Amino acid sequence: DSAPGQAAVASAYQRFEPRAYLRNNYAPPRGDLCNPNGVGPWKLRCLAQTFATGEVSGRTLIDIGSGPTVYQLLSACSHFEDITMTDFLEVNRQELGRWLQEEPGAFNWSMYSQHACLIEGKGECWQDKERQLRARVKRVLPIDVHQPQPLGAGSPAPLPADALVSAFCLEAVSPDLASFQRALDHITTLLRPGGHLLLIGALEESWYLAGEARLTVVPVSEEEVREALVRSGYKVRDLRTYIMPAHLQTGVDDVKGVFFAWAQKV
Amino acid sequence: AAVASAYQRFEPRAYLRNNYAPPRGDLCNPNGVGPWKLRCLAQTFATGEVSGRTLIDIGSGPTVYQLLSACSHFEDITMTDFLEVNRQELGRWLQEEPGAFNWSMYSQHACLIEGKGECWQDKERQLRARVKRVLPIDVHQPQPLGAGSPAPLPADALVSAFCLEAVSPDLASFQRALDHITTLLRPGGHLLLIGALEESWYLAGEARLTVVPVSEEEVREALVRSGYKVRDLRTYIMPAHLQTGVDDVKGVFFAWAQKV
Numbered sequence: 001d002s003a004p005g006q007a008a009v010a011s012a013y014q015r016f017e018p019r020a021y022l023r024n025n026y027a028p029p030r031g032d033l034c035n036p037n038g039v040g041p042w043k044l045r046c047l048a049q050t051f052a053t054g055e056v057s058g059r060t061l062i063d064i065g066s067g068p069t070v071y072q073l074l075s076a077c078s079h080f081e082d083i084t085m086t087d088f089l090e091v092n093r094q095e096l097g098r099w100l101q102e103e104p105g106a107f108n109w110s111m112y113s114q115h116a117c118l119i120e121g122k123g124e125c126w127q128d129k130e131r132q133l134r135a136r137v138k139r140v141l142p143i144d145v146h147q148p149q150p151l152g153a154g155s156p157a158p159l160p161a162d163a164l165v166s167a168f169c170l171e172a173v174s175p176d177l178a179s180f181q182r183a184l185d186h187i188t189t190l191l192r193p194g195g196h197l198l199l200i201g202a203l204e205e206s207w208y209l210a211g212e213a214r215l216t217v218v219p220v221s222e223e224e225v226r227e228a229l230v231r232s233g234y235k236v237r238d239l240r241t242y243i244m245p246a247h248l249q250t251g252v253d254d255v256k257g258v259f260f261a262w263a264q265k266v
Numbered sequence: 267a268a269v270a271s272a273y274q275r276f277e278p279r280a281y282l283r284n285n286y287a288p289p290r291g292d293l294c295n296p297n298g299v300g301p302w303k304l305r306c307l308a309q310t311f312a313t314g315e316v317s318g319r320t321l322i323d324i325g326s327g328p329t330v331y332q333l334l335s336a337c338s339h340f341e342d343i344t345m346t347d348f349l350e351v352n353r354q355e356l357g358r359w360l361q362e363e364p365g366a367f368n369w370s371m372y373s374q375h376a377c378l379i380e381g382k383g384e385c386w387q388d389k390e391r392q393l394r395a396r397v398k399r400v401l402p403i404d405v406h407q408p409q410p411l412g413a414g415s416p417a418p419l420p421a422d423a424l425v426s427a428f429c430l431e432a433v434s435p436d437l438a439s440f441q442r443a444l445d446h447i448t449t450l451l452r453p454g455g456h457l458l459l460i461g462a463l464e465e466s467w468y469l470a471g472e473a474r475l476t477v478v479p480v481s482e483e484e485v486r487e488a489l490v491r492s493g494y495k496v497r498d499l500r501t502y503i504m505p506a507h508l509q510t511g512v513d514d515v516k517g518v519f520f521a522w523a524q525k526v
């Protein structure tokens with residue numbers, strides 16, 4: 001079973017809104033980094049503090065379902081010299097490309113880049129951060145989390161990878177907890193034993209709007225998320241919860257919170 | 267008595283490209299003169315020992331960077347300059363009009379050095395908040411603001427960057443103009459002064475201006491001669507890659523002194 005639900009999301013995402021998605025989630029005021037209790041700051045804080053331990057370093061990194069965004073690698077690029085970026089839609093790989101080349105009409109991430117520099121407290125100016133990322137991002141490859149080999153056979157990516165990053169993928173492209181738990185299993189086939197996984201997801205989210213489609217996805221929870229990481233060969237080192245305030249409960253989702261997980265593969 | 271007429275020819279927008287656009291205004295290299303200046307101010311304030319209610323910025327010119335670290339410690343500050351073209355240029359930045367100079371790059375790097383987690387927009391609007399007025403001034407006057415000015419004298423603290431040395435023909439009229447502004451300060455109030463070292467001229471478009479060449483120890487002697495006690499005085503040595511054709515400045519000094 002379970003392949004029908006998956007096919008439902010692949011359909012829902014063919015209506016996907018590359019630049020509309022950014023304007024409505026990462027441009028102000030939904031993305032206001034001035035607010036220190038808010039959600040942009042929190043995600044970036046979790047990423048900066050985790051790499052601050054230095055215990056997550058190496059050679060190769062893979063972003064799992066990057067979408068058309070980068071904030072999730074900002075604090076992370078000073079620590080890996082080979083970044084792999086991935087998404088399922090060509091039109092999202094193409095919007096990232098609009099940003100690696102530095103065109104006008106590419107999304108201005110600079111206000112995230114600065115906040116990350118501020119949190120890391122190393123004196124870095126956001127332009128050198130943005131130059132570092134554009135150096136280390138070596139490839140941008142198609143991804144499907146529901147395959148047994150998510151990039152395909154003989155993929156370009158240097159494998160195994162030393163760590164993994166993923167923001168709002170699995171709980172957002174999986175229709176049932178079984179689909180999730182197996183997708184989490186698929187990407188760990190890419191993480192070398194002893195490497196680290198950094199995850200960010202929605203909590204108790206069952207429906208959201210990708211372009212025009214109203215797709216159906218798993219109401220996942222903090223405790224289910226732990227249980228699923230252990231089930232796949234990790235030990236959970238960190239697991240933090242953000243409670244979604246009233247200021248951003250549009251009517252686009254039933255998202256009640258967001259979680260960050262740091263787990264290491266045994 | 268003979269006074270620097272040369273300043274009516276001073277283009278503000280060309281001074282701004284000369285000094286605060288890159289290379290000198292590229293804050294990415296941290297051995298550079300821009301970062302260095304901002305550090306001195308943040309460090310002096312992070313002590314909390316400079317604090318109060320009122321602050322006056324003398325010879326501000328068309329610049330604002332010198333109050334970024336400052337506005338978190340004084341609720342009422344006023345900015346001053348001799349020339350109207352400059353008070354107008356501050357006007358357009360504080361009121362957010364167009365044609366206004368983009369200072370964000372400097373706000374950004376001040377939020378970075380302090381490390382309060384500050385949004386650089388919050389820093390900018392806190393300053394626009396706390397600037398109350400933009401008044402003219404002549405530092406050679408025994409009273410440089412005129413009588414009965416809107417300003418709340420005596421201030422808790424003063425700031426001045428690249429002013430006195432850039433407006434005095436010789437050491438003594440500089441030493442005089444320093445005397446002239448100490449009169450503006452509450453005893454026990456603090457002075458934060460930045461200027462050029464062994465500079466003699468600089469360019470501001472068509473204007474070609476004259477500076478008296480001063481040294482670190484000369485700069486110290488003049489502060490005690492005005493009734494100050496220096497709690498810090500440091501020197502930046504202008505590196506080759508910032509020696510362009512806009513002046514002959516050889517270094518930059520910073521001073522933290524307390525009126526006794």
Ligand SMILES: Nc1ncnc2c1ncn2[C@@H]1O[C@H](CN(CCC[C@H]2CNCc3c2ccc(Cl)c3Cl)CC[C@H](N)C(=O)O)[C@@H](O)[C@H]1O
Nearest residue numbers: 065066067069088089143144145167168172173202208255
């Ligand atoms: N089978 C598949 N296999 C592999 N990859 C697939 C598959 N199917 C689809 N993808 C690709 O996953 C990407 C999901 N993408 C948007 C979803 C998040 C969205 C959901 N609603 C709650 C949540 C939203 C985001 C922000 C917040 Cl705060 C909230 Cl509330 C992540 C964006 C980026 N990573 C980000 O961090 O913003 C997308 O680019 C697909 O193309």
Ligand SMILES: Nc1ncnc2c1ncn2[C@@H]1O[C@H](CSCC[C@H](N)C(=O)O)[C@@H](O)[C@H]1O
Nearest residue numbers: 325326327329348349404405427428432433
């Ligand atoms: N006689 C005088 N009395 C007081 N200020 C004067 C003056 N003659 C010129 N000035 C001002 O002193 C400034 C010197 S350069 C401006 C320095 C400024 N604080 C900065 O950081 O860039 C000029 O703006 C000029 O208008």
Ligand SMILES: [K+]
Nearest residue numbers: 428432462468
């Ligand atoms: K000068």
